[PDB]
Structure formats: structure tokens, C-alpha cells
Amino acid sequence: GHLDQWRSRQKIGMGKGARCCVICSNQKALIRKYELNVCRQCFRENAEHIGFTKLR
């Protein structure tokens, strides 16, 4: 039915569509290193809180 078809492709959970920023839900330019799963723009704003600092 329509429920079965609804979001069937998304239920697969592979590719860029499955992933998203844990802060802003954007799916573009996601940082997956160390399983941060934060988009680069969000990471720059929240870098100090996470623990990173701008050395060299």
C-alpha cells in the first residue's frame, strides 16, 4: 500500500541520504572521522566545546 511505498528507499539506509549532521540534519559535507557525524560548518562553530583547539 501507500504506507509500504512511503519512504521505502530511505528505509534501506545506505549512501549519503542515510547520514546527516547530528546538529542540523544537513546531509552535505559530513565529517565522519572518529564517528563525529557533524557537518563541517557546524563543527567549526562547535569545535571548542567538543574539545578541539586551533593550534598551528
Partner 1 sequence: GPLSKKRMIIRDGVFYAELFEFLKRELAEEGFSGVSYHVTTLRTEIVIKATKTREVLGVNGRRIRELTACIQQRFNYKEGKLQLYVERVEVRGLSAMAQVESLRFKLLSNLQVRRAAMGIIRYVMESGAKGCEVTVGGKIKGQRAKSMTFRDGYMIKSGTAHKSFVDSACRHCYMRAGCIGVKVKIMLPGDSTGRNGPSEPLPDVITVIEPK
Partner 2 sequence: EGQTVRLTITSRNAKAVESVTSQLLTRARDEKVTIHGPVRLPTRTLKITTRKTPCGNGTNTWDTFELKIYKRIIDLHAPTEQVKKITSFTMESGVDVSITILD
Partner 3 sequence: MSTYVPKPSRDNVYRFFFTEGVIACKKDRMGTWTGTLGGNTFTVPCIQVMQLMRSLKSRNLIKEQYAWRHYYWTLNDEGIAYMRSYLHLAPSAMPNTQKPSSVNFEK
Known binding residues for Zn(2+): 21, 24, 39, 42
Subset of 1-56 contacting partner 2 (CB under 8 A): 31, 33-34, 36, 40-41, 43-44, 47, 50-56
Subset of 21-40 contacting partner 3 (CB under 8 A): 22-23, 25
Nearer to partner 2, 1 or 51 (CB): 51
What's the half-sphere exposure (Cβ side, CA atoms, 13 Å) at 5?
2
50 binds Na ion (CB under 5 A): no
CA dist., res. 47 & res. 6, Å (int): 37
27 binds Na ion (CB under 5 A): no
**Closest by Cα among 46, 52, 10, 6 to 27:** 10
